[PDB]
Design a protein around this nucleic acid. Structure first.
Ligand code: MG
Ligand code: MG
Ligand code: MG
Ligand code: MG
Ligand code: MG
Ligand code: MG
Ligand code: MG
Ligand code: MG
Ligand code: MG
Ligand code: MG
Ligand code: MG
Ligand code: MG
Ligand code: MG
Ligand code: MG
Ligand code: MG
Ligand code: MG
Ligand code: MG
Ligand code: MG
Ligand code: MG
Ligand code: MG
Ligand code: MG
Ligand code: MG
Ligand code: MG
Ligand code: MG
Lengths: 58, 94, 116, 84, 54
RNA sequence: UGCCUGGCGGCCGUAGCGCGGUGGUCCCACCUGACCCCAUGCCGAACUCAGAAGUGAAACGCCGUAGCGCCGAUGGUAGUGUGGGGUCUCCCCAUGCGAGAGUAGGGAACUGCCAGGCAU
RNA sequence: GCUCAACGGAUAAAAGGUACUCCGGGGAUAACAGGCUGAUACCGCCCAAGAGUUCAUAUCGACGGCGGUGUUUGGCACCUC
RNA sequence: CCUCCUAAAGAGUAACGGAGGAGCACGAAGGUUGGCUAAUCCUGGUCGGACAUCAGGAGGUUAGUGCAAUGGCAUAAGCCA
RNA sequence: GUGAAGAGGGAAACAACCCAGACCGCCAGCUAAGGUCCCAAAGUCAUGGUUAAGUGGGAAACGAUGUGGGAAGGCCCAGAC
């Protein structure tokens, strides 16, 4: 039920394809895109995978 | 005969240990005995100077942690591969 | 050792039966007594057991270690298996040469009704 | 010392890779007759409902799910097919 | 090309901490001088270490 | 129910080896003898048959033993996925995974079914 | 029934010269020069056995070690066919 | 064409990279049933020894696998009938 | 991963390096890498250290009372160096 906001803060150019797929799964589309998602262990795992290029407003 | 002031480690692992060894301390363990092991955070320079004596590895050390004194033996020592520094000390409750 | 050699001999047919899933009529022959068991395919449950060591079988026997005692014990084990409805088993000679007392037990069981 | 010298090599031979190894891993669900592992010699053994071909290829003999287990006194590795 | 080369000399890869030479039965200062003389012939930085119980 | 023994397993060294001891009413083993059934590329050794005098000697079972084998943490170390950095053929930092060896220590297995024996 | 072994086997059946040469192409690929690199080469320096009547270091300097230059022989094939 | 490595713990993966083999053999060296377990060393023993056959022990598969190497193999895939 | 087939900002210049993916227009704002003395937009910013070599702004073994920090140790007002 709890919802976090995820803001992409770095480019996806030159990232690993798995990182790009994680960005797509989160739904982030471009730098400075902020999306709202639910707070699940799976979502936390995605954020941990791409933690270097996204910021989380919990 | 030698007293070693020790403090309780808060975080364990590779990162925390390397942080200690940079900050001029080094991890150590007190195992043996009938109770659970205790991880401690020794002062590297003092312990190196005090272990310079050859009787460090023979007499029963005393360790002061939280005022509680523990009578120990120096069981095993890990040294830096190419430096006069210590990386880890195994103490046995005795 | 003799029993070590016997176990080594038996193990192949025992494993074949154990993977096939056959109910197993395992024999065990000693110089004095001859034992027979019928065991479930899992190997940890003894369905029936007839032996010359027990009074009900022994008291009708002169000597417990010969072909006639073997025939008596085979007859007994086969009839008890038929009363438990075991019907169809497979023979585990346990390394013993299928001959003499073991063969006599086998024929006694076959004529009594166990199918193998 | 002008151009070069010379000298042949005696090697430079090899054979087509055979594509051995485990085909269906533990937990998978196979159809009857599915090859579970191609191997040289019984590195893996045939457990329940698993048959061993001439080239020691293990194939499932019954529909179900693969299951590896260490079994026996020699701690060998047996592939079994749980009934599914 | 045209294959590999021929074996010419044998080496022993050295990693930090490896105790190359050991010596016994001599005074410590003479050991230091001998080890200095030896290290002068090697392409790797060295140091003088002593025996310890553990 | 207790304990001993035999069989079939479970499991596959905390379960194996060594060393010391102990068991024969029952079981087991050794044992006695070969028209025989059956047998040895010779030999009743083994396999087999007919038995039971004797002994637990060997084997086996059990018990006790740490001399080994075996298992074995906590901690540290090595390595390493992702992101950075350095005087970059090697390293370091953040974070995640984290051994091998070794140390303390444990350790002389445990357990199911059936049958027989003894004390009930 | 093919050592069709150049082994997916151009024919059943086939070797050479060209400085007398010719055409299409290539710096996809060589010789000359340039380039990168520096094994080699050349020049330095470190340790110092020893030689030097005694004395390692006036002058040499073994066994080894560390660099510089781009001065030869090279390596590569980046420019130019 | 076969085997190991490179090959980066699924498969696959190049070099004029590092090592070796094949162009078969067998009517039994195949099937099945029954049975058996090796190398080596030590001790004792006629010719007879370091190495022949015999007996005992230690050992533990350090053997064998018709031929390369790998993976296997004690329930034997090894050895007899 | 990038270039090929990706412009733009940075690395002085510098396909392939760092940042970042150009639909068009604007004499609007916030930033990434990288920077803020002048060329040349932005700190002659604040705090505490270090360097005296133009190091910064090429290079090793090795050498040295350069300087800064640290933990010891030796001899000392029977007055030590
Ligand atoms: Mg780390
Ligand atoms: Mg090749
Ligand atoms: Mg461990
Ligand atoms: Mg061809
Ligand atoms: Mg071809
Ligand atoms: Mg022309
Ligand atoms: Mg070119
Ligand atoms: Mg040229
Ligand atoms: Mg040149
Ligand atoms: Mg040019
Ligand atoms: Mg040009
Ligand atoms: Mg692979
Ligand atoms: Mg891989
Ligand atoms: Mg064969
Ligand atoms: Mg065969
Ligand atoms: Mg093109
Ligand atoms: Mg660009
Ligand atoms: Mg692109
Ligand atoms: Mg640009
Ligand atoms: Mg530049
Ligand atoms: Mg520019
Ligand atoms: Mg676009
Ligand atoms: Mg701004
Ligand atoms: Mg300005």
């Amino acid at each position: 039920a709890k919802t976090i906001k995820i803001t992409q803060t770095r480019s996806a150019i030159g990232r690993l394809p798995k990182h790009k797929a994680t960005l797509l799964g989160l739904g982030l589309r471009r730098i400075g895109h902020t999306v709202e998602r639910e707070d699940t262990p799976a979502i936390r795992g995605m954020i941990n995978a791409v933690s270097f290029m996204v910021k989380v407003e919990e | 005969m030698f007293t070693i002031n020790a403090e309780v480690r808060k975080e364990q692992g590779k990162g925390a240990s390397r942080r200690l060894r940079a900050a001029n301390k080094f991890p150590a363990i007190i195992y043996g005995g009938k109770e659970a092991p205790l991880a401690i955070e020794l002062d590297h320079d003092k312990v190196m100077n005090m272990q310079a004596k050859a009787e460090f590895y023979s007499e029963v050390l005393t360790i002061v942690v939280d005022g509680k004194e523990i009578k120990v033996k120096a069981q095993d020592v890990q040294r830096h591969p190419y430096k006069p520094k210590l990386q880890h000390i195994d103490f046995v409750r005795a | 050792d003799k029993k070590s050699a016997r176990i080594r001999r038996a193990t192949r047919a025992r494993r074949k039966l154990q993977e096939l899933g056959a109910t197993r009529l395992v024999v065990h022959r000693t110089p004095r007594h001859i034992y027979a068991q019928v065991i479930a395919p899992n190997g940890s449950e003894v369905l029936v057991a007839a032996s010359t060591v027990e009074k009900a079988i022994a008291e009708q026997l002169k000597y417990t270690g010969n072909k006639d005692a073997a025939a008596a014990v085979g007859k007994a084990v086969a009839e008890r298996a038929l009363e438990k409805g075991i019907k169809d088993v497979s023979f585990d000679r346990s390394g013993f040469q299928y001959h003499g007392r073991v063969q006599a037990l086998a024929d006694a069981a076959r004529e009594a009704g166990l199918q193998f | 010392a002008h151009k070069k010298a010379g000298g042949s090599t005696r090697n430079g031979r090899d054979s087509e890779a055979k594509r051995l190894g485990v085909k269906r891993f533990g937990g998978e669900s196979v159809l009857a007759g599915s090859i579970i592992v191609r191997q040289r010699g019984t590195k893996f053994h045939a457990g329940a409902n698993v048959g061993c071909g001439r080239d020691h290829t293990l194939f499932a003999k019954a529909d179900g799910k693969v299951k590896f287990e260490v079994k026996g006194p020699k701690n060998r590795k047996f592939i079994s097919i749980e009934a599914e | 090309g045209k294959g590999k080369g021929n074996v010419e000399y044998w080496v022993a890869l050295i990693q930090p901490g490896k105790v190359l030479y050991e010596m016994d039965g001599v005074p410590e200062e003479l050991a230091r001088e001998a080890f200095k003389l030896a290290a002068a012939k090697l392409p790797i930085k060295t140091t003088f270490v002593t025996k310890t119980v553990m």
